[PDB]
Design a protein around this ligand. Structure first.
Ligand SMILES: [Cl-]
Ligand SMILES: [Cl-]
Lengths: 423, 423
């Protein structure tokens, strides 16, 4: 089928033939089809929609466009992915918990950009740690350690990376079928059997309304099922970042404290909820999660994982190896109760401090960040420290501006449930 | 606003602010906005729509993107535009009639492609006649002769040409607002005060194609009203080509005969209908049209116009200057009454003979063509000549095939009026 004919077919709201859909998209992959014809098709797909079958075919075509992992020889291979949000540290706790529960948590993580963080960036805060490894080393550590986090995530479903870049500059990102297929294409390529998705719910950017989140969750589950995978989505709120640390080295510190049984309650609650869903998908006793965490087995897995990838295992016991910058107190200029801490704005603050990157490929300062002392529900008096800002005397004024804007105080606080529902 | 936000705005079905629409498009004309962003917007506009003001602003933006002809000092500047159909010779008669009725008929015409013909191609059959001329020559001839037909140049409404080329490869052509704004942008740039539209229905089921033609006419009239121009549309039928000649030299011969008062009745009726509408729009007496024709003033005007643009005016009296190729009669292999002569198939016949071009820019043969002896309503006896074919021993077999298919005979016929309605 001719490209113009393919675009027209969708423009008229017709359903594509999988044969034509694959030909069109792969033509784009090989640069045989111009970006302007693909963007026209994306807009038509966005507006006229893609049905469950079309959505599945799109997912599979993208999943097979690059590197594909086969974890069939490994025990209970699971994965976790976040939909929305600004890239939190929950995986640094969920991974260890699942690996210590008899599962194989071998995945590829990405890097942050602007206001969003990335697990790979956080882990590079650990001296010696490396996300680069060969296919053989990845499978070897998956088998021996049970927990592996590799970089080069983009090598998975390159067609998705290409299509996403186009969607991002043509206003065709926010479409449920396109979001669902994008996320699932990378999960199908990564090879895990059971996948748990954390979908952030709320009113604002990087958040989906309840209606949208439920539709997205239902769609990703259907795609997974259609491909023989087991999928479960957990919808959670985001009235503030999970935990108190936002940044890189500071977040690794917090994840370690959590694994030691000294972490923030909200982070622990969500991490266990996600781990428990993964276990249920694999037919494992969900009770194993809390057991692995409170017993220290999870911390043990995290330590072995760091060591296996070059990281200095000493960092687990001595935070001197995960240094932070200069500390500056952010003081409240009002009386009241914290009702919200805009995660987006906290991310903008971290970015201003140099803890984020403005351009892909640029390095970042792993020692800067924010530590939230007051979270929703907390009462704060004027002059009291809301947060601690770790800076390198760079963009501190802008950072403080964003952090102040992030905080929303009032007379009363009715913090919403952290975990809304599972789908 | 940024390009992505502009696209998103239309994607959401919102109405653009004039300044933003101008900025986005002018940015595209200057290659500051990528084609893939413009095609994404084109698809959004196609599916979500453009309201009357947006359609007007789009038209105005494209109209002033290049040169804008000033005819304000010339008496009653008018023009006729043909939408749909296969590019007939009505202008060869309407122009001379109006120029001889006190109006100025100064316009830009185009060339044919495939099964369609073009006025510039037809007139070039007159030895010496050319449509290329400077703006100064255009205005001088418009003032002195009153009738001037120039070859279209990228100088006028260049944004339209750029947008059309993109729409043609992104399945975004078939949208009334986009088609109407395209046609009207060129008319606004050309400067006529009153514009008569000859609208023929597209290909397909009559109820749908008529619906579209009616919407297109209404839309172009609305743009005209909003732009301060007088517009009137006449929707014409096409049960057969207008007149008997189809080609180039052969069509000029017929136009001349029509101007001498010996042409086919149908051609004359439609030409006078269009000329009369233009006269009415200009507040002039419609009766002047028939007077210019029957008195011979239109013929003298056509002759002066041919001479003014380099042609040998003697062509009007000596057709040896408009030579035809080898004649071959197409005889009926059946009897009955002609019900239709598919103009598209007749066009394919002329194309096969070399009277049309397969690709933009290729030369054509001015001497080949078809002369229809039987029209809708005419009785045909077996062996009787349906039409005469002028060929240069190339594509004759194929041409005769298209022509036989073009002819639809039956037991009876009831030809519809030549002009279906006015808008
Ligand atoms: Cl978007
Ligand atoms: Cl189209």
């Amino acid at each position: 089928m001719n490209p113009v004919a393919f675009i027209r077919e969708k423009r008229e709201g017709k359903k594509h033939r999988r044969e034509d859909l694959e030909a069109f998209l792969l033509g784009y992959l090989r640069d045989e089809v111009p970006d302007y014809q693909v963007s026209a098709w994306l807009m038509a797909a966005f507006l006229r929609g893609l049905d469950p079958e079309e959505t599945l075919w799109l997912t599979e075509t993208m999943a097979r466009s690059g590197k594909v992992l086969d974890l069939s020889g490994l025990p209970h291979p699971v994965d976790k992915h976040s939909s929305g949000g600004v890239g939190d540290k929950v995986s640094l706790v969920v991974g260890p918990i699942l690996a210590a529960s008899g599962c194989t948590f071998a995945k590829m993580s990405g890097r942050g950009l602007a206001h969003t963080g990335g697990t790979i960036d956080k882990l590079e805060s650990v001296p010696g740690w490396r996300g680069e490894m060969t296919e053989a080393e990845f499978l070897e550590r998956a088998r021996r350690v049970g927990l592996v986090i590799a970089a080069q995530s983009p090598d998975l479903a390159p067609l998705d990376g290409k299509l996403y870049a186009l969607r991002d500059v043509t206003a065709t990102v926010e479409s449920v079928p396109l979001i669902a297929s994008s996320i699932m294409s990378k999960k199908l390529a990564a090879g895990a059997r059971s996948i748990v998705l954390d979908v952030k719910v709320g009113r604002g950017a990087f958040m989906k309304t309840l209606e949208e989140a439920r539709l997205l969750a239902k769609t990703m589950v259907a795609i997974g099922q259609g491909a023989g995978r087991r999928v479960r989505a957990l919808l959670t709120s985001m009235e503030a970042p999970l935990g108190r640390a936002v940044g890189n080295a500071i977040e690794v510190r917090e994840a370690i404290e959590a694994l030691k049984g000294e972490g923030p309650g909200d982070l622990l609650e969500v991490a266990l909820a996600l781990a428990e869903e993964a276990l249920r998908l694999e037919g494992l006793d969900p009770a194993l999660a809390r057991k692995a965490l409170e017993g220290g087995a999870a911390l043990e897995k995290f330590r072995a994982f760091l060591e296996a990838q070059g990281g200095d295992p000493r960092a687990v016991e001595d935070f001197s190896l995960l240094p932070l910058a200069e500390e500056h107190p952010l003081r409240a200029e009002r009386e009241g109760v914290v009702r919200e801490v805009d995660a987006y704005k906290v991310g903008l603050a971290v970015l201003a401090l140099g803890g984020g990157r403005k351009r892909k490929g640029e390095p970042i300062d792993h020692g800067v960040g924010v530590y939230l002392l007051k979270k929703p529900g907390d009462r704060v008096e004027r002059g009291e420290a809301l947060a601690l800002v770790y800076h390198r005397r760079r963009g501190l004024e802008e950072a403080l501006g964003h952090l102040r804007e992030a905080y929303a105080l009032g007379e009363e606080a009715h913090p919403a449930p952290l975990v809304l529902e599972a789908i």
